[PDB]
Amino acid sequence: PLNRRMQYSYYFPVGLFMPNPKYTTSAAIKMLDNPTQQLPVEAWIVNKN
Amino acid sequence: PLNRRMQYSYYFPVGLFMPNPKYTTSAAIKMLDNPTQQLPVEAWIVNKN
Amino acid sequence: PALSASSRALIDEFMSVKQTHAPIHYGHYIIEEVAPVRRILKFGNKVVF
Amino acid sequence: PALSASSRALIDEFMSVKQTHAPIHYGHYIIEEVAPVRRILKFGNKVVF
């Protein structure tokens, strides 16, 4: 009886839009898109495995 | 009889194409070819030695 | 909150450098998870705890 | 999976910097072997376990 099963929720959004005066803080990534117009359409989640 | 052998299956891609909105993560690598149109026709492996 | 990134660029920049990955990019964002359990993330060979 | 590198440049930069190497370049990609045998790569002086 001491192998209890503990349950809790998770939540995460997809499809958000950042305000227009945009900023960064990572010197690495160069996405080759137009910076001012890009918008996220999908989400990526890391599975249990 | 204890000197045994194990058999694996080694998996290997070659000749793939990436989606169009192409991105990079590291700034060090520099190539004089245009980034929009690049396609690999070979695959490089490390040998046993 | 659970691990949600808008593109593979942000998940790769999170996985390669843990501390100074950009939490938010121009139009793409990422969230690190905060959960009572902590899980080892493995990608290729690199490991983030 | 086994070590696959589309260009000599990507495998060079992998050998040089183990953690911060870029897994997906603009059109070229690299795959790190995840196999129960962990071999030692001795390209030149530098070594990756």
From Swiss-Prot, chains C, D:
It is found in: Virion; Host nucleus. Self-assembles to form an icosahedral capsid with a T=16 symmetry, about 200 nm in diameter, and consisting of 150 hexons and 12 pentons (total of 162 capsomers). Hexons form the edges and faces of the capsid and are each composed of six MCP molecules. In contrast, one penton is found at each of the 12 vertices. Eleven of the pentons are MCP pentamers, while the last vertex is occupied by the portal complex. Homomultimer. Makes the hexons and eleven out of twelve pentons. Interacts with triplex proteins 1/TRX1 and 2/TRX2; adjacent capsomers are linked together in groups of three by triplexes, heterotrimeric complexes composed of one molecule of TRX1 and two molecules of TRX2. Interacts with scaffold protein; this interaction allows efficient MCP transport to the host nucleus. Interacts with capsid vertex component 2/CVC2. Interacts with the small capsomere-interacting protein/SCP. Belongs to the herpesviridae major capsid protein family. This is Major capsid protein. It comes from Epstein-Barr virus (strain B95-8) (HHV-4).
